Amino acid sequence: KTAVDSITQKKFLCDRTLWRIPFSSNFMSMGALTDLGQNLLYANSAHALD
Amino acid sequence: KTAVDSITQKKFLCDRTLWRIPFSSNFMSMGALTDLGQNLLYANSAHALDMTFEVDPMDEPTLLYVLFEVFDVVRVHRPHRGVIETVYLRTPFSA
Amino acid sequence: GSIPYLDGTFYLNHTFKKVAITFDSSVSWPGNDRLLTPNEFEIKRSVDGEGYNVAQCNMTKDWFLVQMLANYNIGYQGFYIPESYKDRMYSFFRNFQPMS
Amino acid sequence: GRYVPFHIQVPQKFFAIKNLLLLPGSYTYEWNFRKDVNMVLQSSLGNDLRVDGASIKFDSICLYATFFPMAHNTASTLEAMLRNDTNDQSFNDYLSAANM
Amino acid sequence: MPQWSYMHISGQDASEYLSPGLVQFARATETYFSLNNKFRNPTVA
Amino acid sequence: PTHDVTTDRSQRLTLRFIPVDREDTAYSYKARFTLAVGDNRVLDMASTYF
């Protein structure tokens, strides 16, 4: 009856794992050599990353 | 040593399950459309049904939940971009 | 103590907010208007009102989707509980602990 | 807390729609929802929540769907093939029974 | 029966009633865009 | 495969929809979504959720 007004705190834990961004067009494990790993733009030019 | 004379009481519990009586001659799952299900006597004929259940008495009302296993199928046709027609079939017991 | 670089006991994964990937000067990845934030992967958001969080925590749908596609390739045919043999000790879901 | 501003994710459960592959077009998706606390909520003691003070007010609702990033020629050949009469889609219920 | 077959309850195999090009396409794209669940396989005693 | 599967063309992997019309009674509420499935947009309905 006497309950104080409250806020909600949401969270999570995630131990033992690495965050992954696989380098593929549709983010699928279709082959060990990704489809993106083979396209011409990355293969026939040099590119810097930021 | 001082033990009285005794009688024995037996019972069992069975929570979460549904009791099942499949429509098969030997009662095996050998496929979903059953052999009694393919036979010609049953197929072209009409039949009425009368089942009689015995259950234990309760001190407030209860309900007997009977699931009649039937086929409940749907065919889906999409003829042109944005149009959709659907054909529903439930047999036995068609609406 | 335990040595995470060698033995794999990572635990500060939660302390990331969002990631931005940029090839050369302004060449975005994955880009081509693939995500609601197209140029940046937003991991977490303090009190969403736009409906971008998921699973009763403050992690986003897009990120959750990504992690399920990377770890188990589940995404496209919908979310379900990953197979027990695939979902190993170092795998994401196995270690996911939502709290409120 | 008794006071909870919540967020919840709910799927489609009806067998035909939930195994469907939806081809290009515009289509209406409309549903009807329950607000009755004795139905939508569950308590350990089964007491009447309408009378003993639980309540729910739904601020807002959002809808989400995941898409394949397919090649247009393939996409055209795959739409074409499923619009043909011999190639109609077929479904059935897992429980498949009439309830009494 | 005829109309069971029309509705595929008593029908033929799924690979056999779909267009071949489409079967062939489904068999290539299965592992990464599953199409088996879309179409009935009726088991018959 | 580096062809005949994926695209590099513009489009969203996942769409967010907000109701066109909502009507509410004292016990119940119906919501309207208009699903606009675009040119070459391939959608498996198993992935749908409110």
Short mmCIF file of C-alpha atoms in Angstrom, two decimals:
data_model
loop_
_atom_site.label_atom_id
_atom_site.label_comp_id
_atom_site.label_asym_id
_atom_site.label_seq_id
_atom_site.Cartn_x
_atom_site.Cartn_y
_atom_site.Cartn_z
CA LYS A 1 0.00 0.00 0.00
CA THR A 2 2.87 2.30 1.11
CA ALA A 3 5.16 1.50 -1.98
CA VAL A 4 7.59 4.38 -2.91
CA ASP A 5 7.60 5.72 -6.52
CA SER A 6 10.33 3.91 -8.51
CA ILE A 7 12.61 3.87 -11.45
CA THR A 8 13.72 0.80 -13.46
CA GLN A 9 17.31 -0.12 -14.03
CA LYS A 10 17.95 -2.67 -16.78
CA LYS A 11 21.21 -4.51 -17.45
CA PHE A 12 23.04 -7.73 -18.46
CA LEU A 13 26.23 -9.70 -18.02
CA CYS A 14 28.01 -11.64 -20.76
CA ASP A 15 31.22 -13.38 -19.54
CA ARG A 16 33.63 -15.56 -21.63
CA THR A 17 32.99 -14.27 -25.18
CA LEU A 18 34.27 -11.80 -27.87
CA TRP A 19 32.19 -9.43 -29.78
CA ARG A 20 32.18 -10.51 -33.47
CA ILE A 21 31.69 -8.58 -36.76
CA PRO A 22 32.39 -11.16 -39.49
CA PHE A 23 33.51 -9.57 -42.81
CA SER A 24 30.59 -10.69 -45.23
CA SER A 25 27.87 -9.04 -47.21
CA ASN A 26 24.80 -10.74 -45.56
CA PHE A 27 26.81 -11.79 -42.33
CA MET A 28 26.58 -15.52 -43.17
CA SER A 29 29.00 -18.49 -42.70
CA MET A 30 28.56 -19.67 -46.30
CA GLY A 31 32.27 -20.61 -46.72
CA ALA A 32 35.49 -20.22 -44.85
CA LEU A 33 36.70 -17.75 -47.47
CA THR A 34 33.92 -15.17 -47.34
CA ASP A 35 32.30 -13.87 -50.44
CA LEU A 36 33.34 -10.34 -49.41
CA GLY A 37 36.87 -11.58 -48.81
CA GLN A 38 37.06 -12.27 -52.53
CA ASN A 39 35.31 -9.28 -54.22
CA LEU A 40 37.40 -7.14 -56.65
CA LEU A 41 37.29 -3.82 -54.76
CA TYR A 42 39.18 -5.15 -51.77
CA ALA A 43 41.44 -7.35 -53.77
CA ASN A 44 42.69 -5.06 -56.64
CA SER A 45 43.15 -1.88 -54.47
CA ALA A 46 44.76 -0.75 -51.18
CA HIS A 47 42.45 0.78 -48.51
CA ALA A 48 43.16 2.42 -45.15
CA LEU A 49 40.78 1.93 -42.19
CA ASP A 50 39.58 4.26 -39.43
CA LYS B 1 9.64 -55.87 17.03
CA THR B 2 6.40 -54.32 18.41
CA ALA B 3 4.91 -53.78 14.91
CA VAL B 4 1.13 -53.76 14.38
CA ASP B 5 -0.64 -55.76 11.63
CA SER B 6 -0.63 -53.79 8.33
CA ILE B 7 -2.35 -53.44 4.90
CA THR B 8 -0.77 -51.98 1.66
CA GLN B 9 -1.92 -48.93 -0.33
CA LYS B 10 -0.77 -48.43 -3.96
CA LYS B 11 -1.26 -45.42 -6.35
CA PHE B 12 0.57 -43.45 -9.00
CA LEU B 13 0.95 -39.93 -10.36
CA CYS B 14 1.27 -38.82 -14.03
CA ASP B 15 1.54 -35.02 -14.43
CA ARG B 16 1.89 -32.97 -17.82
CA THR B 17 1.03 -35.71 -20.39
CA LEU B 18 -1.98 -36.26 -22.67
CA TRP B 19 -3.29 -39.84 -23.09
CA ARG B 20 -3.09 -41.04 -26.65
CA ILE B 21 -5.14 -43.75 -28.61
CA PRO B 22 -3.84 -43.65 -32.30
CA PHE B 23 -6.17 -44.90 -35.19
CA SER B 24 -3.71 -47.83 -36.17
CA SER B 25 -4.36 -51.64 -36.46
CA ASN B 26 -1.28 -52.57 -34.18
CA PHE B 27 -1.24 -49.12 -32.44
CA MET B 28 2.19 -48.15 -33.96
CA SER B 29 3.21 -44.81 -35.51
CA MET B 30 4.21 -46.10 -38.95
CA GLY B 31 3.18 -42.74 -40.58
CA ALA B 32 0.51 -40.13 -40.04
CA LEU B 33 -2.24 -41.41 -42.48
CA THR B 34 -3.06 -44.69 -40.89
CA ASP B 35 -4.03 -48.01 -42.31
CA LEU B 36 -7.52 -47.91 -40.74
CA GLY B 37 -7.50 -44.37 -42.22
CA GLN B 38 -6.98 -45.84 -45.75
CA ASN B 39 -9.52 -48.69 -45.57
CA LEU B 40 -12.67 -48.64 -47.76
CA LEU B 41 -15.31 -49.71 -45.24
CA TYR B 42 -14.77 -46.61 -43.08
CA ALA B 43 -14.09 -44.17 -45.96
CA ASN B 44 -17.40 -44.28 -47.98
CA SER B 45 -19.63 -44.98 -45.01
CA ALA B 46 -21.29 -42.86 -42.25
CA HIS B 47 -20.79 -43.74 -38.54
CA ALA B 48 -22.04 -42.28 -35.30
CA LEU B 49 -19.83 -42.42 -32.16
CA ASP B 50 -20.51 -43.29 -28.50
CA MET B 51 -17.69 -43.18 -26.03
CA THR B 52 -18.07 -43.93 -22.24
CA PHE B 53 -15.50 -42.72 -19.75
CA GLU B 54 -15.15 -43.68 -16.04
CA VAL B 55 -13.37 -41.12 -13.87
CA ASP B 56 -13.00 -40.52 -10.06
CA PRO B 57 -15.65 -38.28 -8.29
CA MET B 58 -14.78 -34.71 -7.37
CA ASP B 59 -16.33 -32.31 -4.85
CA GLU B 60 -16.58 -29.44 -7.48
CA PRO B 61 -17.30 -29.69 -11.24
CA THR B 62 -14.57 -30.76 -13.74
CA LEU B 63 -14.20 -30.99 -17.52
CA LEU B 64 -13.29 -33.99 -19.86
CA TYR B 65 -10.97 -32.50 -22.54
CA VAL B 66 -11.15 -34.76 -25.70
CA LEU B 67 -8.91 -33.72 -28.68
CA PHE B 68 -10.33 -35.43 -31.94
CA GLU B 69 -7.17 -35.96 -34.07
CA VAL B 70 -8.00 -34.79 -37.60
CA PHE B 71 -6.15 -33.17 -40.63
CA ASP B 72 -6.18 -29.33 -40.65
CA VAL B 73 -4.43 -28.19 -43.81
CA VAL B 74 -4.00 -24.90 -45.67
CA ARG B 75 -3.01 -24.22 -49.34
CA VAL B 76 -1.62 -20.70 -50.13
CA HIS B 77 -1.77 -19.04 -53.69
CA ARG B 78 -0.39 -15.64 -54.47
CA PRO B 79 -1.32 -14.96 -58.11
CA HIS B 80 -0.17 -11.35 -58.74
CA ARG B 81 1.88 -8.72 -56.91
CA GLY B 82 -0.28 -7.87 -53.82
CA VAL B 83 -2.98 -10.49 -54.14
CA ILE B 84 -3.40 -13.67 -51.99
CA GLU B 85 -5.98 -16.56 -51.92
CA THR B 86 -6.22 -19.26 -49.31
CA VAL B 87 -7.79 -22.65 -49.28
CA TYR B 88 -8.45 -24.14 -45.78
CA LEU B 89 -9.33 -27.86 -45.29
CA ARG B 90 -10.23 -29.70 -42.06
CA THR B 91 -11.33 -33.35 -42.40
CA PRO B 92 -12.92 -35.00 -40.48
CA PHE B 93 -15.02 -32.13 -39.09
CA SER B 94 -15.18 -29.49 -41.88
CA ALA B 95 -16.43 -25.87 -41.24
CA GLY C 1 44.78 -14.38 -11.04
CA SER C 2 43.09 -15.64 -14.29
CA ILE C 3 44.69 -14.22 -17.44
CA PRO C 4 41.89 -13.31 -20.04
CA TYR C 5 44.31 -12.74 -22.93
CA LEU C 6 45.38 -16.49 -22.53
CA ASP C 7 42.57 -18.31 -20.76
CA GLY C 8 39.60 -16.50 -22.27
CA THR C 9 37.87 -15.11 -19.27
CA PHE C 10 36.59 -11.80 -20.75
CA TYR C 11 34.06 -9.85 -18.69
CA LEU C 12 34.24 -6.13 -19.68
CA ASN C 13 32.19 -6.83 -22.94
CA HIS C 14 29.35 -4.83 -21.27
CA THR C 15 31.44 -1.64 -21.08
CA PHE C 16 30.99 -0.95 -24.90
CA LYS C 17 28.39 1.57 -26.16
CA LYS C 18 28.56 1.69 -29.97
CA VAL C 19 31.03 0.99 -32.79
CA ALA C 20 31.64 3.08 -36.05
CA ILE C 21 33.55 1.43 -39.03
CA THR C 22 35.09 3.82 -41.67
CA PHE C 23 37.27 2.79 -44.62
CA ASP C 24 39.54 5.57 -46.18
CA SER C 25 38.08 9.17 -45.91
CA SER C 26 34.12 8.64 -45.62
CA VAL C 27 33.67 5.13 -47.08
CA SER C 28 31.20 3.49 -44.75
CA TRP C 29 30.92 -0.28 -43.90
CA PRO C 30 28.59 -2.27 -44.20
CA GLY C 31 26.56 0.87 -45.35
CA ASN C 32 23.87 0.95 -48.31
CA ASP C 33 21.20 1.71 -45.66
CA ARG C 34 21.26 -1.73 -43.97
CA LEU C 35 20.66 -0.74 -40.29
CA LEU C 36 18.43 1.94 -38.64
CA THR C 37 21.74 3.72 -37.62
CA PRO C 38 23.42 2.94 -41.00
CA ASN C 39 27.06 4.10 -40.33
CA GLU C 40 27.29 2.75 -36.65
CA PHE C 41 26.46 -0.38 -34.69
CA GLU C 42 24.79 0.77 -31.53
CA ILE C 43 25.27 -1.85 -28.78
CA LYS C 44 23.31 -0.24 -25.85
CA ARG C 45 20.78 2.68 -25.21
CA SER C 46 19.68 4.26 -21.85
CA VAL C 47 15.78 4.05 -21.77
CA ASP C 48 14.56 3.45 -25.40
CA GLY C 49 11.28 5.05 -26.50
CA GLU C 50 11.71 4.33 -30.12
CA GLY C 51 11.57 0.55 -29.69
CA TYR C 52 15.17 -0.37 -30.44
CA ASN C 53 16.02 -2.48 -27.26
CA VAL C 54 15.41 -6.17 -26.82
CA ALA C 55 15.07 -9.19 -24.39
CA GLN C 56 14.56 -7.25 -21.22
CA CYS C 57 17.79 -5.52 -21.04
CA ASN C 58 19.27 -2.46 -22.66
CA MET C 59 20.96 -4.25 -25.61
CA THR C 60 19.59 -3.35 -29.05
CA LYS C 61 17.73 -5.60 -31.57
CA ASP C 62 20.15 -4.90 -34.45
CA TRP C 63 23.17 -5.92 -32.26
CA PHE C 64 21.38 -9.00 -30.84
CA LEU C 65 20.55 -10.01 -34.41
CA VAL C 66 24.19 -9.55 -35.42
CA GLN C 67 25.45 -11.67 -32.55
CA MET C 68 22.98 -14.43 -33.29
CA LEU C 69 23.98 -14.40 -37.08
CA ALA C 70 27.76 -14.38 -36.26
CA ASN C 71 27.56 -17.11 -33.54
CA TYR C 72 24.80 -19.54 -34.80
CA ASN C 73 23.57 -18.08 -38.24
CA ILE C 74 19.97 -18.07 -36.81
CA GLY C 75 18.74 -14.54 -37.86
CA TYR C 76 16.84 -14.77 -41.20
CA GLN C 77 14.49 -17.69 -40.46
CA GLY C 78 13.83 -16.16 -36.97
CA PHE C 79 15.02 -16.39 -33.41
CA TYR C 80 14.99 -19.64 -31.45
CA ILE C 81 16.94 -21.27 -28.69
CA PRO C 82 20.27 -22.38 -30.17
CA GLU C 83 21.16 -26.17 -30.23
CA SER C 84 22.92 -27.35 -27.02
CA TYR C 85 25.97 -28.88 -28.82
CA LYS C 86 26.57 -25.64 -30.76
CA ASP C 87 26.05 -23.35 -27.82
CA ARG C 88 29.35 -23.91 -26.00
CA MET C 89 31.04 -22.37 -22.94
CA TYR C 90 32.53 -19.44 -24.86
CA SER C 91 29.58 -18.86 -27.19
CA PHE C 92 27.40 -15.74 -26.60
CA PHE C 93 23.87 -17.01 -25.57
CA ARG C 94 25.28 -19.46 -23.04
CA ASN C 95 26.77 -16.58 -21.20
CA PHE C 96 23.94 -13.96 -21.67
CA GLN C 97 22.46 -12.88 -18.32
CA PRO C 98 19.69 -10.26 -18.63
CA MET C 99 18.73 -8.45 -15.39
CA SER C 100 16.14 -5.79 -14.29
CA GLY D 1 8.83 -3.21 -7.78
CA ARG D 2 4.95 -3.36 -8.10
CA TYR D 3 5.26 -0.38 -10.51
CA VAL D 4 7.04 -1.72 -13.79
CA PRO D 5 7.33 0.11 -17.02
CA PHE D 6 8.03 -2.94 -19.20
CA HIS D 7 8.99 -3.95 -22.70
CA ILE D 8 8.00 -7.30 -24.22
CA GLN D 9 8.59 -9.08 -27.61
CA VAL D 10 5.62 -11.33 -28.93
CA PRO D 11 5.61 -13.50 -32.17
CA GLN D 12 2.92 -14.84 -34.56
CA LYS D 13 1.84 -18.25 -33.49
CA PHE D 14 -0.68 -19.30 -36.04
CA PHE D 15 0.83 -22.08 -38.12
CA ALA D 16 0.10 -20.92 -41.73
CA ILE D 17 1.36 -17.31 -41.28
CA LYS D 18 4.44 -18.31 -39.18
CA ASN D 19 5.99 -20.69 -41.82
CA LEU D 20 5.11 -18.30 -44.73
CA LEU D 21 7.53 -16.73 -47.20
CA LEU D 22 6.11 -13.32 -48.14
CA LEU D 23 6.66 -12.17 -51.80
CA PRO D 24 6.71 -8.35 -52.91
CA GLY D 25 3.41 -6.36 -52.57
CA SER D 26 1.71 -4.30 -49.93
CA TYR D 27 -0.31 -6.16 -47.41
CA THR D 28 -2.46 -5.41 -44.24
CA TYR D 29 -1.43 -7.03 -40.97
CA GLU D 30 -4.03 -6.34 -38.26
CA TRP D 31 -4.59 -8.12 -34.79
CA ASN D 32 -6.73 -7.87 -31.67
CA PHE D 33 -5.23 -7.81 -28.19
CA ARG D 34 -6.35 -8.72 -24.56
CA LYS D 35 -5.86 -6.26 -21.63
CA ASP D 36 -7.67 -8.51 -18.83
CA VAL D 37 -5.29 -8.91 -15.98
CA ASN D 38 -6.67 -12.40 -14.95
CA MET D 39 -5.85 -13.67 -18.42
CA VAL D 40 -2.75 -11.73 -19.56
CA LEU D 41 -1.03 -12.06 -16.06
CA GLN D 42 -0.33 -15.07 -13.94
CA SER D 43 0.06 -15.14 -10.18
CA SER D 44 1.38 -17.90 -7.90
CA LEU D 45 -1.81 -17.79 -5.69
CA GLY D 46 -4.47 -17.28 -8.38
CA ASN D 47 -6.22 -14.41 -6.59
CA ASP D 48 -8.48 -11.95 -8.56
CA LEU D 49 -6.31 -9.07 -9.72
CA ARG D 50 -9.13 -6.81 -10.94
CA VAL D 51 -10.47 -6.58 -7.28
CA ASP D 52 -7.08 -6.76 -5.45
CA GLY D 53 -5.43 -3.84 -7.54
CA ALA D 54 -3.25 -4.91 -10.44
CA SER D 55 -3.56 -2.69 -13.63
CA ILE D 56 -2.12 -2.26 -17.13
CA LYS D 57 -2.07 0.62 -19.51
CA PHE D 58 -0.26 0.09 -22.90
CA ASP D 59 1.76 3.17 -23.84
CA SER D 60 2.81 2.00 -27.26
CA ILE D 61 3.46 -0.85 -29.71
CA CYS D 62 6.11 -1.31 -32.49
CA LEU D 63 6.39 -4.21 -35.25
CA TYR D 64 9.61 -5.85 -36.62
CA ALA D 65 10.49 -8.16 -39.53
CA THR D 66 13.81 -9.58 -41.00
CA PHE D 67 14.64 -9.56 -44.81
CA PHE D 68 17.09 -11.41 -47.13
CA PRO D 69 19.51 -9.13 -49.22
CA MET D 70 19.06 -11.15 -52.37
CA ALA D 71 20.23 -10.44 -55.99
CA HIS D 72 17.46 -8.93 -58.11
CA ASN D 73 17.52 -11.48 -60.98
CA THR D 74 17.37 -14.32 -58.44
CA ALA D 75 14.69 -12.51 -56.53
CA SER D 76 12.66 -12.14 -59.78
CA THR D 77 13.08 -15.89 -60.70
CA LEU D 78 12.13 -16.86 -57.11
CA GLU D 79 8.95 -14.61 -57.09
CA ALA D 80 8.09 -15.89 -60.53
CA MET D 81 8.30 -19.52 -59.57
CA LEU D 82 6.02 -19.29 -56.50
CA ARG D 83 3.16 -17.34 -58.31
CA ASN D 84 2.67 -20.38 -60.65
CA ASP D 85 -0.31 -22.74 -59.99
CA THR D 86 1.59 -26.01 -59.67
CA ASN D 87 3.99 -24.32 -57.12
CA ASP D 88 1.40 -23.20 -54.43
CA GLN D 89 2.61 -23.33 -50.76
CA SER D 90 1.23 -25.95 -48.29
CA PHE D 91 0.88 -26.07 -44.47
CA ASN D 92 -0.59 -28.18 -41.59
CA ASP D 93 -1.08 -27.96 -37.72
CA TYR D 94 1.38 -29.95 -35.34
CA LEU D 95 -1.52 -30.65 -32.71
CA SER D 96 -4.01 -31.08 -35.64
CA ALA D 97 -7.26 -31.96 -33.74
CA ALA D 98 -10.77 -30.60 -33.00
CA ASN D 99 -11.17 -29.64 -29.36
CA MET D 100 -14.13 -30.58 -27.14
CA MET E 1 -8.95 -40.21 -53.35
CA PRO E 2 -8.87 -37.24 -55.81
CA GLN E 3 -9.31 -34.11 -53.67
CA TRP E 4 -6.91 -35.21 -50.93
CA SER E 5 -4.22 -35.33 -53.62
CA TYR E 6 -5.24 -31.88 -54.94
CA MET E 7 -4.60 -30.57 -51.34
CA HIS E 8 -1.48 -32.77 -51.03
CA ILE E 9 -2.77 -34.76 -47.88
CA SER E 10 -2.63 -38.11 -49.89
CA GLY E 11 -0.31 -36.44 -52.44
CA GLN E 12 3.05 -37.11 -54.09
CA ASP E 13 6.49 -36.10 -53.02
CA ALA E 14 7.31 -32.51 -52.55
CA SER E 15 10.44 -32.54 -54.85
CA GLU E 16 8.22 -34.18 -57.53
CA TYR E 17 5.19 -31.74 -57.44
CA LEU E 18 7.41 -28.54 -57.32
CA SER E 19 8.92 -27.23 -60.67
CA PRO E 20 12.45 -28.86 -61.24
CA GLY E 21 14.29 -25.51 -61.59
CA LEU E 22 12.76 -24.49 -58.25
CA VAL E 23 13.74 -27.97 -56.70
CA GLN E 24 17.20 -27.56 -57.96
CA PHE E 25 17.26 -23.90 -56.61
CA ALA E 26 15.95 -25.08 -53.22
CA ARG E 27 18.58 -27.90 -52.97
CA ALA E 28 21.40 -25.18 -53.71
CA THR E 29 20.05 -22.60 -51.20
CA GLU E 30 18.88 -24.94 -48.36
CA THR E 31 21.80 -24.72 -45.82
CA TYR E 32 21.64 -20.85 -45.73
CA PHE E 33 17.92 -20.12 -46.63
CA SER E 34 15.91 -23.28 -45.65
CA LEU E 35 12.90 -24.07 -47.92
CA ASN E 36 11.98 -27.66 -46.64
CA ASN E 37 9.43 -26.48 -44.04
CA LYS E 38 7.43 -24.41 -46.69
CA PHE E 39 5.93 -27.40 -48.46
CA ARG E 40 4.18 -30.67 -47.09
CA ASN E 41 5.74 -34.13 -46.90
CA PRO E 42 2.79 -36.46 -46.08
CA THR E 43 3.79 -39.72 -44.32
CA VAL E 44 1.71 -42.74 -45.45
CA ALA E 45 1.33 -46.06 -43.56
CA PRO F 1 29.39 -17.83 -53.75
CA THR F 2 30.47 -14.33 -54.99
CA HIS F 3 27.32 -14.14 -57.29
CA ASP F 4 23.60 -15.06 -57.86
CA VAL F 5 22.81 -14.91 -54.07
CA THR F 6 23.52 -11.47 -52.38
CA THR F 7 23.28 -7.82 -53.53
CA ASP F 8 25.19 -4.58 -52.96
CA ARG F 9 21.99 -2.62 -53.72
CA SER F 10 20.29 -0.26 -51.12
CA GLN F 11 17.67 -1.70 -48.65
CA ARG F 12 17.11 -2.41 -44.94
CA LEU F 13 17.81 -5.87 -43.45
CA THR F 14 15.09 -5.42 -40.86
CA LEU F 15 11.90 -3.04 -41.02
CA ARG F 16 10.28 -1.16 -38.02
CA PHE F 17 6.53 -0.43 -38.28
CA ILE F 18 4.38 1.88 -36.14
CA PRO F 19 0.64 1.53 -36.08
CA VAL F 20 -1.56 3.21 -38.79
CA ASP F 21 -4.65 3.05 -36.61
CA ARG F 22 -5.13 1.77 -33.05
CA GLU F 23 -8.53 1.27 -31.42
CA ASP F 24 -8.94 0.36 -27.72
CA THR F 25 -11.86 -0.77 -25.49
CA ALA F 26 -11.93 -1.12 -21.74
CA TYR F 27 -10.84 -4.84 -22.09
CA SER F 28 -9.35 -5.09 -25.61
CA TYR F 29 -7.30 -3.31 -28.42
CA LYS F 30 -6.75 -3.84 -32.15
CA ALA F 31 -3.71 -2.53 -33.99
CA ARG F 32 -3.16 -1.93 -37.72
CA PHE F 33 0.14 -2.48 -39.55
CA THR F 34 0.60 -1.95 -43.30
CA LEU F 35 3.35 -4.24 -44.55
CA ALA F 36 5.06 -2.69 -47.62
CA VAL F 37 7.08 -5.46 -49.17
CA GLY F 38 9.30 -3.61 -51.77
CA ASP F 39 10.86 -4.46 -55.17
CA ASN F 40 13.18 -7.46 -54.59
CA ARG F 41 12.47 -7.66 -50.79
CA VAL F 42 12.43 -11.27 -49.58
CA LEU F 43 10.60 -11.74 -46.25
CA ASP F 44 10.26 -14.97 -44.14
CA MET F 45 7.31 -14.35 -41.79
CA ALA F 46 8.82 -16.55 -38.92
CA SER F 47 10.93 -13.50 -38.10
CA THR F 48 7.97 -11.27 -37.22
CA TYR F 49 7.44 -9.69 -33.79
CA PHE F 50 5.54 -6.98 -31.79
#
